[PDB]
Amino acid sequence: KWAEEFAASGRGDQRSVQELINRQAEWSEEVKNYDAAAEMYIKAKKYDRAIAILAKHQWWDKLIGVVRQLDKTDARCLGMCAGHFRRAPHFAYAKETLLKMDDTKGLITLYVE
Numbered sequence: 001k002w003a004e005e006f007a008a009s010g011r012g013d014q015r016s017v018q019e020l021i022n023r024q025a026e027w028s029e030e031v032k033n034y035d036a037a038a039e040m041y042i043k044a045k046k047y048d049r050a051i052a053i054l055a056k057h058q059w060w061d062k063l064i065g066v067v068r069q070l071d072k073t074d075a076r077c078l079g080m081c082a083g084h085f086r087r088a089p090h091f092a093y094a095k096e097t098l099l100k101m102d103d104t105k106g107l108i109t110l111y112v113e
Helices: 002-008 017-030 034-041 047-056 060-067 076-087 091-099 104-111
Strands: none
Touching: 002 017, 017 034, 034 047, 034 060, 047 060, 047 076, 060 076, 060 091, 076 091, 091 104
16 A cells, blocks of 8 residues: 555655565565556566466456557567467457558468467
C-alpha cells in the first residue's frame, strides 16, 4: 500500500517508484502470485518478465495482454509471442503479431503456421 503510495505520488515527497513497484512485483513472485506479478511487472516495465510469466504459466490471455501492453514500440512481445502463440493454440496472435506491421509476404510462412 505505502510502497505504491510513494510509487504514484508519495506522501509529500517522492521515494523510489520502481524500487517499491518491483518490491511488490517480486514479492508477488515470492508468494507465487504470478498473474499479479506480471500485472506489477507491466507496472515495473518488466513486460519481458511479465510476458515470460504469462507464456510459461499458460496465461495466453494475459500473454497477448502484455503483447498489447508492451506494444509495437517495444515490439519484443509481438515476435516472441508469435513464438509463444505457436506453442499456444492461438494462431490468430502469431498471424496478427506478424500482420501488425504487414508481412503478408512473410505470412506465407505465418499462414502455413
